[PDB]
Design a binder for these strands. Structure first.
Length: 577
DNA sequence: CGATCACGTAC
DNA sequence: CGTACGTGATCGC
């Protein structure tokens, strides 16, 4: 049982508590707080938010760093409280992050899933209480209050066994000194938001909508008929039945119309290039023009992404609503989308700094490959150097195509090399791709040793680890199905690389946030895109940031090879190039 | 109205 | 061949 409290009392403000500040809306930016639960040595309390969040003593308790709180997904509460002008401090245990570190593959997304890991089931899943999708609703106060108190009581009960296992895993510091501080930095980034030049976005959509109608009309002529070009089904009928184009790849229901397939068909018919062009144009229009405009706040013209810190199997962040980690950059036409991301104050600028080849640098370090490490110590172009080695030529004799093929091998090596997936990438045979890989491993025998050893370790221990002791369990490493076992071996190879690079940029972010405060700079972190950080800052801070940000990022850890950071700034994200 | 499947964008 | 997220179509409810 529990107290359904009319008033905040002093015994609710003990210096250690499990705290529930319930935000049911999936997107928590400026969202309602539907209820509060406090469990401490003195009892269990449910508070209505309109009462508690107006009580100065409760608010002061929330903001007191010395009053320690155990929570689940504290960034959600912190951000929702930021939008009410209320500061949340003292969060010393985040059960979501603790569960994520212990085993990211559980998909732990609510208190009940984490509690099940320790045989605790006296709490319902959020989806049972709130329902799903259309039927999603906040239940009446008695049902609501019991749920929130059960969650807090679960958090209260679960802190000790989770911290105990984290210690056994040598992951206690990972939680307390990396993920939990990073959660506060992400809350600040999300709350700040990124300012969007919506008028520029709208005028892009207007010229895109002109060009879409042009290509669209040309497509119907060359097809001799109108059809929904966006349907892979109808399009496959125009292409592979009406126009008789060769079927180079079947899907499961019909024929593949992926861009890769369409590349090969363009010589046979003028329609294919137009469908390609229609597809690129339509991708920008629907996902990056219309998509972005839908999530801009009309008052501030900012987008406030949500960084999912407890989701990827490797330790990377993900970004939602909008995803700001996949804004186009490769093709110029899509890169112009970044012109719409602008500083949020006048006479400020966008500063962007990115690690140069952090994954291959991490690989050099963990493999202790003499050749690969020397290449980075010489700051060589790694793709050209790999081509020189694989194809046994001097630098002068590396052709553009050789470099392109060596680059693809370098990507495969990072992702988990296999004869078949490189062959696919390079449009070559499997025996040919196997010869490339064999020649890579002859040139980098330390990388070969590392790939063999880490697979054997994943089989022996049941998991692989990263630099800062993140882990990923790989039960499929022992499967007797070749496809399933191979994916697990590739994950054994890739996760220490991708995950270690994630560890490093997360530590950089923490170190950078500390340095910016020490230096009293107004510069603020806005975004992280896996190996780059995006800031905005007064124009008068650029020269100091040119020195400060790359140094903090490069010194975040010490590897057997240097870390190298490139950096640029400009009046928009596009210009920060 | 979910939910699957293709597809495409980033790193 | 790694890791994500969003959009559109399409099916069956």
């Amino acid at each position: 049982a529990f107290t359904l409290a009319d008033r905040v009392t002093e015994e609710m403000l003990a210096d250690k508590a499990a705290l529930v500040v319930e935000v049911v809306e999936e997107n928590y930016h400026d969202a309602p707080i539907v209820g509060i639960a406090v469990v401490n040595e003195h009892g269990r309390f449910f508070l209505r938010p309109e009462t508690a969040l107006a009580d100065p003593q409760f608010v002061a308790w929330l903001g007191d760093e010395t009053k320690k709180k155990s929570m689940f997904d504290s960034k959600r509460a912190a951000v929702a409280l930021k939008w009410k002008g209320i500061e949340l401090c003292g969060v010393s245990f985040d059960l979501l992050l603790a569960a994520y570190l212990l085993d990211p593959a559980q998909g732990v997304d609510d208190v009940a899933a984490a509690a099940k890991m320790k045989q605790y089931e006296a709490v319902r899943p959020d989806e049972a209480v709130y329902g799903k999708g259309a039927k999603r609703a906040v239940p009446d106060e008695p049902v609501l209050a019991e749920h929130l108190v059960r969650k807090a009581a679960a958090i209260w009960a679960l802190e000790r066994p989770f911290l105990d296992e984290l210690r056994r895993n040598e992951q206690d510091r990972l939680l307390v000194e990396l993920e939990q501080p990073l959660s506060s930095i992400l809350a600040e980034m999300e709350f700040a938001g990124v300012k969007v030049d919506t008028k520029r976005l709208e005028q892009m959509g207007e010229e895109l909508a002109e060009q879409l109608r042009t290509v669209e009309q040309r497509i119907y002529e060359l097809a001799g008929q109108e059809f929904n070009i966006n349907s892979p089904k109808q399009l496959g009928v125009i292409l592979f039945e009406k126009l008789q184009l060769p079927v180079l790849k079947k899907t499961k229901t019909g024929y593949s119309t992926s861009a890769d397939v369409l590349e090969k068909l363009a010589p046979y018919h003028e329609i294919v290039e137009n469908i390609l062009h229609y597809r690129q144009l339509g991708k920008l229009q629907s996902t990056y023009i219309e998509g972005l405009l839908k999530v801009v706040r009309p008052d501030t013209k900012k987008v406030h992404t949500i960084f999912n810190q407890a989701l990827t199997q490797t330790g990377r962040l993900s970004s939602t609503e909008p995803n700001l980690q996949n804004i186009p950059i490769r093709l110029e036409e899509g890169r112009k989308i970044r012109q719409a991301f602008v500083p949020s104050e006048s006479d400020w600028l966008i500063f962007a700094a990115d690690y140069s080849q952090i994954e291959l640098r991490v690989l050099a370090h963990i493999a202790e490959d003499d050749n690969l490490m020397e290449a980075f110590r010489r700051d060589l172009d790694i793709h050209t150097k790999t081509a020189m080695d694989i194809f046994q030529v001097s630098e002068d004799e590396v052709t553009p195509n050789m470099r392109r093929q060596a680059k693809a091998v370098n990507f495969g090596i990072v992702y988990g090399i296999s004869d078949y997936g490189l062959a696919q990438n390079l449009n070559i045979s499997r025996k040919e791709a196997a010869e490339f890989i064999e020649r890579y491993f002859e040139s980098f025998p330390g990388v070969k040793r590392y790939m063999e050893n880490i697979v054997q370790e994943a089989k022996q221990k049941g998991y692989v680890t990263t630099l800062l002791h993140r882990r990923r369990y790989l039960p499929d490493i022992t499967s007797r199905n070749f496809n399933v076992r191979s994916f697990a071996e590739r994950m054994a190879m890739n996760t220490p690389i991708q995950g270690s690079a994630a560890d490093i940029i997360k530590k950089a972010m923490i170190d950078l946030n500390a340095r910016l405060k020490e230096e009293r700079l107004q510069a603020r972190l806005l975004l992280q895109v896996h190996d780059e950080l995006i800031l905005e800052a007064p124009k008068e801070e650029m020269e100091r940031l040119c020195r400060l940000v790359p140094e903090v990022m490069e010194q975040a850890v010490t590897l057997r090879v240097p870390l190298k950071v490139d950096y640029h700034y400009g009046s928009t994200w596009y210009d920060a190039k």
